[PDB]
């Protein structure tokens, strides 16, 4: 089977495994090599629509 096929069902949530694994890898990559800082200002700016 291709990885896009198989379903990973969490609570009330449907998604494949390839997409989910790519999302996990992207999370890891962002948390590691993603620049950070001024989180409070980031949140207070994200408050806008």
């Amino acid at each position: 089977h291709n990885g896009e096929q198989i379903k990973y069902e969490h609570l009330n949530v449907t998604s494949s495994v390839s997409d989910f694994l790519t999302y996990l890898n992207g999370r890891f990559s962002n948390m590691v090599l993603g620049h950070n800082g001024d989180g409070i200002n980031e949140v207070k700016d994200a408050r806008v629509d």
Binding site: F28, S29, V32, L33, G34, H35, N36
Partner: protein, 189 residues
């Protein structure tokens, strides 16, 4: 490129009595800015990820003839490259080369927020003498480049904050100029 970026040493971040090792790395005296140490960190058996955001890494370096009247020692940061793979490199300084012979090294990391640190190997290292010499840097040098760069960067950040607070008065002029140029571009086409 021309540089001695071929070497590579692995640092096992494990508590199993990883002893000192003769890495067999022999740079020369008349070598400036081209002596590089490629470190690759490993947690247990596979590479340990790293980042300049969460943690900050440094290395200590000390010649073998270190005395109060004559010696050599430093401690300075690293240059993380391909962090996810647990890889990084250290550009050997220029003042340290003048001191030849055996050398011991060490690489220690500090996790931000908690200041809980980690020490890996305490490995060895060599440096040789060449014929381009005669000047003697017998004066022992000991500078903590980490805190030195810390204070220098704090001063530079204060100065940049000052310049930005000065520019705050120019932002209205920028807005007006941008609006005028937009109106001009409209009236043109």
């Amino acid at each position: 490129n021309f540089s001695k970026d071929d070497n590579l040493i692995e640092l096992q971040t494990t508590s199993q009595y990883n002893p000192v090792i003769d890495t067999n790395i022999s740079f020369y005296e008349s070598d400036r800015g081209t002596g590089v140490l490629n470190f690759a960190v490993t947690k247990n058996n596979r590479p340990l990820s790293i980042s300049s955001e969460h943690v900050k890494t440094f290395i200590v370096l000390k010649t073998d003839d270190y005395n109060v009247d004559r010696g050599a020692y430093i401690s300075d940061e690293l240059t993380i490259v391909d962090a996810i793979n647990g890889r990084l490199q250290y550009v050997i300084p220029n003042e340290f080369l003048k001191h030849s012979g055996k050398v011991h090294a060490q690489a220690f990391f500090t996790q931000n927020g908690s200041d809980n640190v980690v020490v890996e190997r305490q490995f060895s290292f060599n440096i040789e003498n060449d014929l381009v010499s005669g000047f003697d840097g017998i004066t022992k040098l000991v500078y903590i480049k980490s805190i030195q760069d810390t204070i220098e960067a704090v001063g530079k950040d204060f100065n940049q904050l000052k310049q930005n607070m000065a520019d705050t008065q120019t932002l209205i002029a920028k807005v007006n100029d941008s609006a005028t140029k937009g109106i001009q571009q409209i009236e043109i086409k």
